[PDB]
């Protein structure tokens, strides 16, 4: 039952947040087994790192519930309050330009979309607090020639700081993965400089490293910001590499501008060409590594972070229309949408042949060469390195699932979800018998049984794998009309003639 797996969701979304709320209301960071809390700034200030990140899955469950619409509404109210009256961005701190941007500038941003499109709570609140924040992350543009930003910079001050470590280049998904944020907040405020300094990281991404001839479109996760060259580095669709892709093309979802499906569609080429392999003994479709260049070795190890590619390869060949209308489109790609199947199999497959249904933070298909001390998955297509075993309570296989069933309306995505959906039910639960103290945390061993558990609780819990998995359960969907940042926030596709009459155009080409 759709609506009754609903209830469900909601309920679990609801245990967690009742938790959260009563013993780390206003924190940063929370751990369920101990009720404990802490924030991250070091003099102590909130962020309001759970908060902003689920308040739009509040405003989508109170939008759909029908056993706790009131709970939700007053939750809402009081998150929307304590972000107007308690939070406060103007915090003598470094932080993570990608992080804030993604987590709490995207929050903030769906909050106010859902809030003007569902018409609960105060729009204006969220929007405020956008540009505020917006505006503070903004300068971290102005530190180099090349507009690449260095990793953090300091909220009160507006000072810049590279990345400690790798010889001070920043990942390039980080300066890669701002561009959704900054784009709509350029659109809602009409200020065009969101914008511009969001767009110039790519021409020197491109120019200077000779990405599409030399690469092949396929990104090391290393950039110098002050050379706009890369550094030498792994090349992978994992951690500080995955999201570069997304957004290239999640703009041309978002905004129209065609030059990103182009570039998208190199990489996605490039991608199927030296990365893409299948496992033994299922062949199952996987994206690997390259350490040493694109004439190195083929890596068989593989993100967790990875499995997000289902839902992008589908959204882009679909362009969010039902295969059933996609399928007689020129737009449609038979490739991309048959590898997004794939992979999305193989990532449900990661859940499916774990001991405890749930996929680790990583893993390393077989291809016939992993001749230690590894578990190898029921089926034997992939093993489990010992310092790999911990789950995060990460959303991408859900958030692919997701994608996959609204656009095949293939029943069997439902049936995976579920049983995922049971498996963090049943194995990330604390107090599992007591729905009066019952929550989830995240887990340090999802290979041993029982799971041992961990004393945290992800933000992206809320905002991405309850969401996505309700979302899975809604009957109607439309991903026509909304691209979601990598938080999972959603925005709405913006209308091109606006776009024209507000001077937001591509401001560079290749
Ligand atoms: C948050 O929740 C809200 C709901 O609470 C949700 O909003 C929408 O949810 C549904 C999305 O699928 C949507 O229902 C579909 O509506 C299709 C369109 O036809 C119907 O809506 C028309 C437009 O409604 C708006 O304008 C109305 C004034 O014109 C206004 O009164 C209304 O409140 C909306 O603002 C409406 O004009 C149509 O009217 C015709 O039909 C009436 C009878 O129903 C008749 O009285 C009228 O004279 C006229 O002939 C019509 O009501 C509809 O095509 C579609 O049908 C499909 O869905 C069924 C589901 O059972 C399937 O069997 C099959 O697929 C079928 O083809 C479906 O009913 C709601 O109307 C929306 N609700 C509102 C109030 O906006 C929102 O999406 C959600 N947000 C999120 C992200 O969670
Ligand atoms: C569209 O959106 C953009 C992006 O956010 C906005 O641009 C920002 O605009 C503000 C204000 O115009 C800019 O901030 C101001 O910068 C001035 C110049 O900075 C130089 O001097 C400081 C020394 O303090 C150096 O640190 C810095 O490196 C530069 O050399 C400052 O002089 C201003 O300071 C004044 O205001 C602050 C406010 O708290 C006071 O604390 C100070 O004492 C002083 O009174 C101020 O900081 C900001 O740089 C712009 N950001 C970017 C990325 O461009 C647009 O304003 C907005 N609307 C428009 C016009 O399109
Ligand atoms: C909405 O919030 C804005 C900013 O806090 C405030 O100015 C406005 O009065 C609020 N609207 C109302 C009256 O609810
Ligand atoms: O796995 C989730 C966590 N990291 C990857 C990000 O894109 C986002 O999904 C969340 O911050
Ligand atoms: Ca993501």
Redesign the pocket.
Known sequence: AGEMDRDRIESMFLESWRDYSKHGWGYDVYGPIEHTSHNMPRGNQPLGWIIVDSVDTLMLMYNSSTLYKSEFEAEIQRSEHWI?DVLDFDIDAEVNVFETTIRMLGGLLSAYHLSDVLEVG????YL?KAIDLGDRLALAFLSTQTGIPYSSINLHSGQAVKNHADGGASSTAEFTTLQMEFKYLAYLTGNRTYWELVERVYEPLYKNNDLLNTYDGLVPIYTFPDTGKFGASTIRFGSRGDSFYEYLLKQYLLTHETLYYDLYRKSMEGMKKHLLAQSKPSSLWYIGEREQGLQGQLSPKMDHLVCFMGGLLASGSTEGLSIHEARRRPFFSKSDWDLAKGITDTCYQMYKQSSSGLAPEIVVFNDGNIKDGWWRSSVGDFFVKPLDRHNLQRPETVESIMFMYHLSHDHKYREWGAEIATSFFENTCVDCNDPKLRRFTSLSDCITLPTKKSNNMESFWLAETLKYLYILFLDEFDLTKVVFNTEAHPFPVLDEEILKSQSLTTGWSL
Do not use: H, L, P, S
């Open positions: 107007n105060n729009k204006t609140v405020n």
